[PDB]
Write a protein that binds this DNA or RNA. Sequence first.
RNA 1: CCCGCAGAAGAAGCACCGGCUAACUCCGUGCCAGCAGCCGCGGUAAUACGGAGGGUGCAAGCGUUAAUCGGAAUUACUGGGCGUAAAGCGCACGCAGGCGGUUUGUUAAGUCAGAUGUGAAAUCCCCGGGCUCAACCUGGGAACUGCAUCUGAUACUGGCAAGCUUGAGUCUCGUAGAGGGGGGUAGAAUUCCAGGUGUAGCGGUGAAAUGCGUAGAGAUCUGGAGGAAUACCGGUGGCGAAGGCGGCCCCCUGGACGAAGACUGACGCUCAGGUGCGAAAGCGUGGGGAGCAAACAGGAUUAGAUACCCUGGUAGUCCACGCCGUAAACGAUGUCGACUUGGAGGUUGUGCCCUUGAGGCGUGGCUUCCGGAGCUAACGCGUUAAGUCGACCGCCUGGGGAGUACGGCCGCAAGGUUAAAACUCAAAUGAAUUGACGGGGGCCCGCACAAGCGGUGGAGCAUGUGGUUUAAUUCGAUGCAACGCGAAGAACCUUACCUGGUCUUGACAUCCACGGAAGUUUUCAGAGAUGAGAAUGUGCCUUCGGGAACCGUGAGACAGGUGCUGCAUGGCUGUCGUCAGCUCGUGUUGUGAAAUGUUGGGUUAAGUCCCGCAACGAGCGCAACCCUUAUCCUUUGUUGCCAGCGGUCCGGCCGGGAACUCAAAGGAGACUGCCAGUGAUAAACUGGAGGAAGGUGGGGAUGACGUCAAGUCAUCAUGGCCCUUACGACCAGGGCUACACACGUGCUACAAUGGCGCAUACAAAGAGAAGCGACCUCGCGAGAGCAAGCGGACCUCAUAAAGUGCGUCGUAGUCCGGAUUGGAGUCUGCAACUCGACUCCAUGAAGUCGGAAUCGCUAGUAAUCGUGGAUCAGAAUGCCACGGUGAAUAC
RNA 2: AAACUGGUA
RNA 3: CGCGGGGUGGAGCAGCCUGGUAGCUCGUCGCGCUCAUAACGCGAAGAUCGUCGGUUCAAAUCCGGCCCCCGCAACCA
Length: 206
Amino acid sequence: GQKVHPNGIRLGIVKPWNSTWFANTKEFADNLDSDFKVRQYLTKELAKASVSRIVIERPAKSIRVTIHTARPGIVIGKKGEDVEKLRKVVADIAGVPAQINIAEVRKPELDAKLVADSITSQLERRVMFRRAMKRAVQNAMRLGAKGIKVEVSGRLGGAEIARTEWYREGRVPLHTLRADIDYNTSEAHTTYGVIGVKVWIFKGEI
RNA sequence: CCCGCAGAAGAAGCACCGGCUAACUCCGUGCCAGCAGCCGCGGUAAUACGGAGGGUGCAAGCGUUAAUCGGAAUUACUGGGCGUAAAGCGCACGCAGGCGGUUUGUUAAGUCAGAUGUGAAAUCCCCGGGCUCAACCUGGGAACUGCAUCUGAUACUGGCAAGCUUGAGUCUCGUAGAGGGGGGUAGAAUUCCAGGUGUAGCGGUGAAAUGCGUAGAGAUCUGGAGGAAUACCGGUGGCGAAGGCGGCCCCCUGGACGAAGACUGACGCUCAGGUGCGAAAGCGUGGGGAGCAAACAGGAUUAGAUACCCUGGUAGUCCACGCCGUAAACGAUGUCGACUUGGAGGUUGUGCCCUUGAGGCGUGGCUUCCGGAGCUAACGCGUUAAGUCGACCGCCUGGGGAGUACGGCCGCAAGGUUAAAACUCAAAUGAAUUGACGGGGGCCCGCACAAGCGGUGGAGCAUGUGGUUUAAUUCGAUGCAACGCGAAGAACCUUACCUGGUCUUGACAUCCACGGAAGUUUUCAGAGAUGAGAAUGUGCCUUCGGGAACCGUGAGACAGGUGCUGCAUGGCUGUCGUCAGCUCGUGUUGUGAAAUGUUGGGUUAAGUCCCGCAACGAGCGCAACCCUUAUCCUUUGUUGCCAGCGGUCCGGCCGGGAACUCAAAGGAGACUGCCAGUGAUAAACUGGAGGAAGGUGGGGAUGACGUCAAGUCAUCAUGGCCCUUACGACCAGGGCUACACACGUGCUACAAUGGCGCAUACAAAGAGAAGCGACCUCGCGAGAGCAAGCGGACCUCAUAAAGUGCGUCGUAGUCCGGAUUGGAGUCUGCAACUCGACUCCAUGAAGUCGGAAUCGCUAGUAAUCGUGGAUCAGAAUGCCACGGUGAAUAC
RNA sequence: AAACUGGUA
RNA sequence: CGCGGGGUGGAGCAGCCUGGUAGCUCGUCGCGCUCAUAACGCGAAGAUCGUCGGUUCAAAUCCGGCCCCCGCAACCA
Ligand SMILES: [Mg+2]
Ligand SMILES: [Mg+2]
Ligand SMILES: [Mg+2]
Ligand SMILES: [Mg+2]
Ligand SMILES: [Mg+2]
Ligand SMILES: [Mg+2]
Ligand SMILES: [Mg+2]
Ligand SMILES: [Mg+2]
Ligand SMILES: [Mg+2]
Ligand SMILES: [Mg+2]
Ligand SMILES: [Mg+2]
Ligand SMILES: [Mg+2]
Ligand SMILES: [Mg+2]
Ligand SMILES: [Mg+2]
Ligand SMILES: [Mg+2]
Ligand SMILES: [Mg+2]
Ligand SMILES: [Mg+2]
Ligand SMILES: [Mg+2]
Ligand SMILES: [Mg+2]
Ligand SMILES: [Mg+2]
Ligand SMILES: [Mg+2]
Ligand SMILES: [Mg+2]
Ligand SMILES: [Mg+2]
Ligand SMILES: [Mg+2]
Ligand SMILES: [Mg+2]
Ligand SMILES: [Mg+2]
Ligand SMILES: [Mg+2]
Ligand SMILES: [Mg+2]
Ligand SMILES: [Mg+2]
Ligand SMILES: [Mg+2]
Ligand SMILES: [Mg+2]
Ligand SMILES: [Mg+2]
Ligand SMILES: [Mg+2]
Ligand SMILES: [Mg+2]
Ligand SMILES: [Mg+2]
Ligand SMILES: [Mg+2]
Ligand SMILES: [Mg+2]
Ligand SMILES: [Mg+2]
Ligand SMILES: [Mg+2]
Ligand SMILES: [Mg+2]
Ligand SMILES: [Mg+2]
Ligand SMILES: [Mg+2]
Ligand SMILES: [Mg+2]
Ligand SMILES: [Mg+2]
Ligand SMILES: [Mg+2]
Ligand SMILES: [Mg+2]
Ligand SMILES: [Mg+2]
Ligand SMILES: [Mg+2]
Ligand SMILES: [Mg+2]
Ligand SMILES: [Mg+2]
Ligand SMILES: [Mg+2]
Ligand SMILES: [Mg+2]
Ligand SMILES: [Mg+2]
């Protein structure tokens, strides 16, 4: 969209990076490739756990990953057995010793990545978008959001021509760098094509 | 009709499924075939066409066609309309006809009441009865709404008789008026004729020409002829039935209004047919004809102009007598009568009064505007109704055909009046709302214009595109918003495209079987891919039948597609446009679409802010938070720096120090903040002080709701379709670099503000490990050998050019200008021929400032001068980025 | 001063 | 042998008492203007003076022949 990405324009203001590792030009590209590969693998296996965001850092010659989820039971289960296999496989793919950590994020409905997935999941199960999206809105504000905005684009309802529909409630100042906006997207693969979902959540002014 | 035998045995189809209207999916087709009562579907994803499955409706029937009523209040008696949707005759007078104030009597026609007679049967309806129920048949009743006769009622209508005055009318006294017909006369001005002075133009247009004038125009003065109209007064003035009627005077004559008083006594309203009047144009006869002006002539404009414009000009316009009878003949509103809140004016009468006044209080006629209830689709009308009623008349029944054809009547003619049908469409139309647009208006902004500088379009060259050709010249992108664009690097690869040579579970993922360590070395053929051999090697885990890393062969599921659809899409992007706007809640207004807010008075770069207000609040957007830059302060002080001191090959280089530049972390500061003035006292504006920085200080990032079915299926993903012994995969070469032309964006020049030689100044920002590559040696050179240092304030790329100090050229195709071309070289790379970059020697085209046209820029801007970076083995005049010098003009 | 026009669905 | 004027580029044209670089209207090929077309503007190609002989720096303008067209005469086939 012609609007600059909120999660990219505030990286140096109120949005920490999802990767905090340092490296020279000799291995910067290799580190990027490893990070992308591990993220792509992990997000597929942990689809049920509803991972919000995955942060990766470089301890003293090793790989450390921290995944924030609202359903730590699936990834933890009994003892650390379900995380041991994930640790060993991520270490295998990264080529260096790995350490994975689980973080709990309560009130999942207030998370952008998560709210979207909900929507997309629903749509994929032939649910009326209009209402899928309206609940998302209400849910959130109930929880306390100072604002929320939802948008869905594509062949809504299997129509012959694509259409975009959005709902905005509360206050969502996109030009205020002081404010923090949790922005995220998500896609769906329905029999009629691909439907894009896009959610902004405004939590505070600073 | 009843009984007996046997046996589910002999018995279900038609229409429809997009909305109306009950009932949905797939496949085929691709604006074709076809469907269709109306709206309308079908131009590769059809619930509308064809088939299948499923479903809905009806059923021995179902559907289509034909016809009547209904719906249709769409001929409106019950029960419609005519200001603007169709529809008030141009106006008036009036016969027939319709209707008609009030008091009594009489009649009993209309009217109403009762009775009698009649209104065939069948049929319709109510209660019953019989066919096995029903249809069907049948008993009784009701109805048969009507008609006639007789007997009564007398409120209303009608008739007859007799009255009344409020409707209508006559008489007396006055008033205003472009009311009408005839005659007379006056002033101004235009034209023309005669004469006087005078002399080169006049006249007309946007600008011209035609035209008039030296045979004397135009201008000016004197005299005369003739035609037409009456300048102000003159007005939201007047008169007239309408059309219509303006100088002044006379004669004849119509209507209206006011004062009371008297008189008649319903004598009234309306009006088919009929009669009369009736703008302008037009016609007939006879006059007149100054101006104006159809037709016509010429000159202009134009692509054309038998038009708009200009110069002339006939009919006509004028008069008398006749005819024509039509107009947006409009108030788009028929006449008459009654009732219904007001306000402000004009014109014309009249009554009472302290009458002092150009004054107070009343009562009539006509007339203009605004508005209440009411009405109206709305606009609007509103005591002069389009409000509530009554009497009569005229007219309307979708649009076009058509106010047309035929017939009749009228006219000298032109034509007028009355007035159809066939056929064709699903609309035509009225009021109002939102938006857009206007060769409408107002206000405001932007390098929009203007004022300036420098350019492009001319020449050479670089690059992209179109076109053409080619084996291929891969595919995209196309006004602004494509054309140095995807592409931040086409000699192989890249690379899909062309020609050849090869493969078919494959180059790549995954399941299975068998064999085989991987890998390292060479050889035959061949352009290579490729086949075809010899070698070497035969190791980890190893449950001792094998796995994990990996290689070869084979079968089938598959893998694969830069193949199509950006008009199925996600994601991403361009533009209007960094313009200030775009919206939502409740509230209120309107039948409604919608309006309000959001408009108005100020102000701002801003829907920025203040005041007002039928609105009160909020959201996106603007500003502000962010980065950079300009001043100062705290900390820190090397690889950076050197003020005060010292030893100083007298170099910040070596003791040392940290003041300062500087480097990077944290703070201060600028906020219309302090004052003056202006301004509705508010917002705000102008100026001043202080201050490095005065008015969001300069610059960047930041791009609202939406438009362009804008771009991308090729970055990637993805619905549908297609290929899969080829549209997939491998290799050699070629091509994307062609070239009779055109266009876009740039570089280098046409020189003296310069070129060349010597000397010699002053910068910032970046990269560096298959990398940057000092110094030294060789070479006139691109470069080669040696090769330290440096993963970085250290070393290298890397001595910035413009600039300034001297000398030469002295205005030319030149000591400017460099393309082209020949010879000889340097360097990346398996590979420089198609097709790279750089260097040395030689030749030295075009070009001497560039048409129509067109582009950027308002301050460190433009202008011009250097340096770096990405892409990248080797490549820039392109892209990104840093600094030096440094303007002109904005009324 | 001049200043036309815009295939069909 | 028939009274006059003529013959410039694809077409129509200017140079006459003035024998001095071939120019101007419409056509062809370009460019500009416009969203696009027409209109309009700026440009380029295009030549023995119809064809020959005397005269002459010179060219229908000074002349003399040849060929073609037109006013009429041109009969009329
Ligand atoms: Mg239905
Ligand atoms: Mg189909
Ligand atoms: Mg009816
Ligand atoms: Mg009606
Ligand atoms: Mg009338
Ligand atoms: Mg009458
Ligand atoms: Mg009566
Ligand atoms: Mg009677
Ligand atoms: Mg019975
Ligand atoms: Mg019976
Ligand atoms: Mg009967
Ligand atoms: Mg009576
Ligand atoms: Mg009288
Ligand atoms: Mg009549
Ligand atoms: Mg007349
Ligand atoms: Mg006449
Ligand atoms: Mg006459
Ligand atoms: Mg005229
Ligand atoms: Mg008429
Ligand atoms: Mg009139
Ligand atoms: Mg009128
Ligand atoms: Mg009328
Ligand atoms: Mg009114
Ligand atoms: Mg007629
Ligand atoms: Mg007739
Ligand atoms: Mg500016
Ligand atoms: Mg200018
Ligand atoms: Mg050029
Ligand atoms: Mg394609
Ligand atoms: Mg192309
Ligand atoms: Mg194309
Ligand atoms: Mg290639
Ligand atoms: Mg598109
Ligand atoms: Mg309402
Ligand atoms: Mg608005
Ligand atoms: Mg509004
Ligand atoms: Mg305002
Ligand atoms: Mg605001
Ligand atoms: Mg010293
Ligand atoms: Mg100041
Ligand atoms: Mg901003
Ligand atoms: Mg942007
Ligand atoms: Mg398109
Ligand atoms: Mg396209
Ligand atoms: Mg090849
Ligand atoms: Mg190319
Ligand atoms: Mg030189
Ligand atoms: Mg480099
Ligand atoms: Mg560095
Ligand atoms: Mg040379
Ligand atoms: Mg020169
Ligand atoms: Mg390179
Ligand atoms: Mg036309």
